């Protein structure tokens, strides 16, 4: 029975290879060659953001473009304040690994993650003006990966068991369980419809989840080494990866296929986070040689180096208005660069 | 009892996922290009941004 | 025979942009703040840039060449304290590097305890402070030669003083330390598979306390023997040895560089990377 | 997508020879280092030997030394392994591992839960 | 523009007081040295860290000498570790608590530790090497049933180095056999490593009274390399 259950897997999945080949046709770069390129973009440092002690794992910018949240192993939460360069806040984290932060948009609320299996939620505007514990949300067994918050009572949130959880800080109870990835799932991101979003484990693989019923709509595959970045596209029909073998994909949702790879021959280290910015010329990704880069979502051709950086970048985010974007990398540093 | 488990798991996604309608994709890719070309002039960063409007300098 | 004129300006032009160099790139070094010895070296960069501008330039071109005509009462008083608060700057930036050297090489566990960048910057900002504040004692400096001189009662005590502040205590307190950490990691095992390590080490640390040592003992002896002693005050052996060994203590800070900062191969390559940045 | 499926094995007794392959797709075959995992049943996942991108560090396990023969063909994206001279307790399966990160050495697959990047294996038995 | 100028001033005066804040965390953070724990499933790790106390993760704290360690027992992770390993990489040392007795995983043993060491992010950091089980290798070796040289033929060709340091009441074959697998485990550790960080190997059994001065001596070479190569004295 094995075996026939192996043929017929193996018959349905060259069946969709075909479907893909018979929904090819033409491919982006040779309709797309018209297009102008954007040119080289050189960008400086505007104001460098120095407060953290080790390693910037996550950094998320707030709604108002003004005020954003990062990680560090120290076990800090720090908030920071853009325009001005202020720290806003200092939440002082119980277990000294982490590895996600999230801001609610209501700014209000902040989360964090880490080994120790508890998505901690902590709240800013309270009667006594010290920042706490708001709920321990439990559950998970392995180490938590990312979050974010899909309103103001429920996070959706990635950990190291292969199981995604989505939670409701009022109750304190998984809302549902979405178990269809093999390897560990490292990002995930929030469409801007607030009901759709992509997981990335460890297999090389994109599968998306739909929030309300809580069932993989559908699955991208194309990288070759595990991916651990990822990103909508504003309008929410596409989404980029970023793996360890130093290749960008581009997936499109509609159509379920790989449209190009952001990849040079002299790279050789693999991509850690993306950022898709306000537009679409201009597509952010981190690297571990020591430098961030931005590519040309549209032509495939990288446009500037955000070079200043020591150590491995890890995280990358670009305000939703636009202004700026931040990249941490493993020195403890935040720099704005526009 | 868990491999075929498993495995029914794993064909009925697969067979979820082919029901699933299809898009050209050239089209897809014209609706990318209208998009960012239509949110070009509001890019902070694809357009240079004058020092009065930036906040970062 | 011209031996000022075609020394100095060979030192000049082998020390300033050098050193510039090198405080440009190590003022932008991003890991610089995250560690206290960089900022060490920057420290002892500006104070070579300080000593080497203003007395090899200044002092030593213009009043030995188209100068010394100046009225002495404010300038020439005003520029000698400048130039010794460089000598005592450039000394007393080159000691506290050497402390920081012991206190990590000897107890490697307890070194961010006890050095970190916050008191990095309150103990090297207090160096400028406090030789800024001990120069200015040296207004009343003796006139060397000149028609007279007078052994003045500030004067002996004026010298005592420099030698003590720039050779007597931080000679003999490189010595101490250096030879701590050469005893320490001598005595103590090392690793089986570091036979070329202790070699190194100690090479470096008995060159540069030598290096040191040499280059700065003739100028103290020199003035030593000027303030005691029956001196014949002839104008060859008093006046040619005099400018050869003020010579030497100009060499010692031109090359207290090559001694600190061109040794490391991280600076190198940096250094490699950037030559070429420009173009 | 990355598949890894291992060819050839059969019951053979002590002696003999065996020929297995390795039908490697969806990734580069000529930079990742790969290896191979046994399976002794009633037991736990181990490693067999492995190849590096230059194919000049070859390297093998304690158990066998001059038992085992590993060799790969880069251009044809099969990786091989040659028997002789079996004992019966090599009755373990034979997965098709690979190391996942590029241009490097290190790799964590003596896993015993389900690494993704190795295949379903083939039975040999002694 | 005075509200703006008084959120300004609130701004200034909450950024005074994080950094107040954040400036005392600094005074700590360096102070504790992390360390970590890595082996066998069945390797002693909570049980050593747990005797060791007296004196998810099963953190713990301990002060010895003056200076704080920090000792992490990972467990309530999966067996997969190839992606949250990256963490730990300003991480003073790696504790390698490993069986001494069962030779069956002693090879898993060996691909263990070659993969810590060649790993592209852990080459900055030393490897501290416990043996631990010594009383039950002691004990098994004079029974001699379990036949070493089954798992290793060419464990018979080999003789004891000739640094060998005994204890006095030990014997012949279970030294001979030790300083094997020592000697076995070293040929890995000098294959590859150009001197940014060695593998210092202790002998220790999971009751012993002396071990955390073997964790001190190893922390303390480890960062005395780190931080001579960090100056030019190299
Ligand atoms: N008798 C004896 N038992 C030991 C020795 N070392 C470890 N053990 C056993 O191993 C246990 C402690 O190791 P442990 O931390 O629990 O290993 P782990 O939980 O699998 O990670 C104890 O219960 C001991 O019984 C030893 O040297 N002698
Ligand atoms: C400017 C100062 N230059 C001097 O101090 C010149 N003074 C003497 O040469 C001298 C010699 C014998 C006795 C006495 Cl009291 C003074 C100086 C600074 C650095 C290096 C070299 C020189
Ligand atoms: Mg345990």
Redesign the interface.
Do not use: L
């Given at each position: 029975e094995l075996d026939q259950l192996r043929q017929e897997a193996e018959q349905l999945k060259n069946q969709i290879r075909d479907a893909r080949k018979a929904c090819a046709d033409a491919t982006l770069s040779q309709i797309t060659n018209n297009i102008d390129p954007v040119g080289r973009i050189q960008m400086r440092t505007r104001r460098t953001l120095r407060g953290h002690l080790a390693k910037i794992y996550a950094m998320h910018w707030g709604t108002d473009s003004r005020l954003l949240v990062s990680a560090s192993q120290d076990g800090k939460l720090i908030i920071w304040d853009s325009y001005t360069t202020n720290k806003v806040h200092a939440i002082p984290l119980r277990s000294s690994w982490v590895m996600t932060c999230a801001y609610a948009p209501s700014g209000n609320y902040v989360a964090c993650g880490g080994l120790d299996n508890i998505c901690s939620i902590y709240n800013l505007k309270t009667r006594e003006g010290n920042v706490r514990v708001s709920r321990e949300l439990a559950g998970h067994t392995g180490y938590l990966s990312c979050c974010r918050f899909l309103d103001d009572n429920q996070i959706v949130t990635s950990s190291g068991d292969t199981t995604c959880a989505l939670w409701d800080i009022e109750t304190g109870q998984q809302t549902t369980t979405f178990t269809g990835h093999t390897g560990d799932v490292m990002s995930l991101s929030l469409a801007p419809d607030t009901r759709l979003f992509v997981s990335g484990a460890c297999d090389a693989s994109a599968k998306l989840w739909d929030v309300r019923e809580g069932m993989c709509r559908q699955t991208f595959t194309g990288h070759e080494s595990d991916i651990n970045a990822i990103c909508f596209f504003p309008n929410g029909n596409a989404f980029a990866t970023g793996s360890d073998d130093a290749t960008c994909r581009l997936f499109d949702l509609r159509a379920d296929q790989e449209l190009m790879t952001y990849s040079h021959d002299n790279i050789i280290c693999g991509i850690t986070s993306v950022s898709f910015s306000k537009s679409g010329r201009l597509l952010l990704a981190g690297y571990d040689d020591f430098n961030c880069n931005v590519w040309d979502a549209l032509k495939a051709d990288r446009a500037g180096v955000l070079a200043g950086h020591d150590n491995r970048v890890s995280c990358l985010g670009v305000t939703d208005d636009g202004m700026a974007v931040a990249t941490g990398s493993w020195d403890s540093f935040l720099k704005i660069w526009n | 009892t868990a491999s075929i488990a498993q495995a029914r798991k794993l064909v009925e996604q697969l067979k979820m996922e082919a029901n699933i309608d299809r898009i050209k994709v050239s089209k897809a890719a014209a609706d990318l290009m209208a998009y960012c070309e239509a949110h070009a002039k509001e890019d902070p960063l694809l357009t240079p941004v004058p020092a009065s409007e930036n906040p970062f300098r | 025979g011209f031996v000022p004129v075609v020394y100095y300006s060979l030192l000049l032009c082998l020390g300033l942009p050098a050193n510039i160099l090198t405080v440009i790139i190590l003022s932008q070094l991003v890991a610089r703040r995250q560690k206290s010895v960089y900022n060490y070296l920057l420290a002892l960069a500006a104070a070579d840039i300080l000593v080497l501008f203003f007395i090899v330039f200044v002092d030593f071109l213009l009043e030995d060449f188209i100068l010394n005509m100046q009225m002495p009462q404010v300038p020439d008083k005003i520029i000698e304290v400048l130039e010794f608060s460089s000598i005592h700057t450039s000394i007393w930036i080159t000691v506290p590097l050497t402390i920081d050297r012991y206190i990590a090489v000897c107890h490697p566990l307890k070194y961010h305890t006890v050095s970190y960048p916050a008191r990095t910057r309150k103990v090297i900002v207090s160096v400028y402070i406090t030789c800024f504040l001990t120069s200015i004692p040296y207004y009343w400096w003796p006139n060397i030669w000149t028609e007279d001189y007078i052994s003045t009662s500030v004067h002996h005590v004026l010298i005592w003083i420099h030698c003590f502040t720039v050779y007597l205590v931080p000679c003999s307190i490189f010595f101490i330390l250096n030879s701590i950490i050469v005893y320490k990691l001598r005595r103590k095992s090392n690793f089986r598979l570091r036979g070329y390590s202790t070699g190194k080490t100690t090479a470096i640390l008995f060159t540069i306390t030598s290096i040191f040592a040499t280059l700065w003992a003739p100028r103290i002896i020199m003035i030593l023997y000027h303030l005691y002693g029956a001196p014949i005050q002839n104008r060859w052996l008093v006046h040619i040895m005099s400018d050869i060994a003020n010579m030497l203590a100009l060499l010692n800070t031109a090359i207290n560089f090559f001694l600190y900062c061109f040794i490391s191969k991280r600076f190198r390559t940096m250094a490699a990377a950037t030559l070429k940045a420009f173009f | 997508?990355?598949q890894l499926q291992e060819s050839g094995g059969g019951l053979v007794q002590p002696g003999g020879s065996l020929r297995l392959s390795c039908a490697a797709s969806?990734?580069?075959f000529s930079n990742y280092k790969m290896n191979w995992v046994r399976q002794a049943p009633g037991?736990?996942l181990?490693?067999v030997s492995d190849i590096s991108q230059s194919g000049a560090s070859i390297s093998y396990?304690?158990?066998v030394?001059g038992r085992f023969t590993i060799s790969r063909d880069n251009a044809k994206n099969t990786l091989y392994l040659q028997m002789n001279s079996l004992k019966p307790e090599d009755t373990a399966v034979y997965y098709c591992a690979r190391c996942?990160?590029?241009?490097?050495?290190?790799?964590?697959d003596?896993?015993?839960?389900?690494?993704?990047?190795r295949g379903?294996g083939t039975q040999v038995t002694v | 523009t005075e509200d703006q100028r008084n959120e300004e001033k609130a701004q200034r005066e909450a950024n005074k007081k994080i950094e107040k804040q954040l400036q005392k965390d600094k005074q700590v953070y360096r102070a504790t040295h992390r360390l970590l724990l890595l082996g066998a499933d069945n390797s002693g790790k909570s049980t050593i860290v747990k005797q060791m106390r007296i004196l998810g993760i099963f953190e713990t704290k301990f002060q010895v000498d003056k200076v704080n360690f920090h000792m992490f027992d990972v467990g309530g992770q999966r067996d997969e570790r190839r992606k949250w390993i990256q963490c730990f990489n300003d991480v003073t040392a790696i504790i390698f608590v490993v069986d001494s007795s069962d030779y069956n995983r002693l090879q898993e043993a060996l691909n263990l530790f070659k993969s810590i060491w060649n790993n592209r992010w852990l080459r900055t950091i030393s490897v501290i090497l416990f043996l631990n089980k010594q009383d039950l290798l002691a004990e098994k070796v004079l029974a001699g049933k379990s036949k070493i040289e089954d798992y290793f033929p060419e464990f018979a060709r080999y003789t004891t180095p000739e640094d060998a340091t005994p204890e006095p009441g030990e014997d012949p074959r279970v030294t001979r056999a030790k300083y094997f697998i020592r000697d076995e485990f070293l040929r890995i550790s000098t294959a590859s490593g150009d001197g940014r960080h060695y593998c210092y190997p202790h002998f220790t059994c999971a009751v012993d009274t002396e071990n955390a001065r073997r964790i001190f001596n190893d922390c303390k070479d480890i960062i005395l390399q780190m931080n001579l190569r960090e100056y030019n004295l190299v």
């Open positions: - | - | - | 997508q990355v969806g990734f580069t037991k736990g181990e490693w396990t304690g158990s030394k996942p990160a590029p241009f490097t050495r290190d790799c964590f003596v896993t015993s839960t389900t690494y993704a990047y379903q | -």
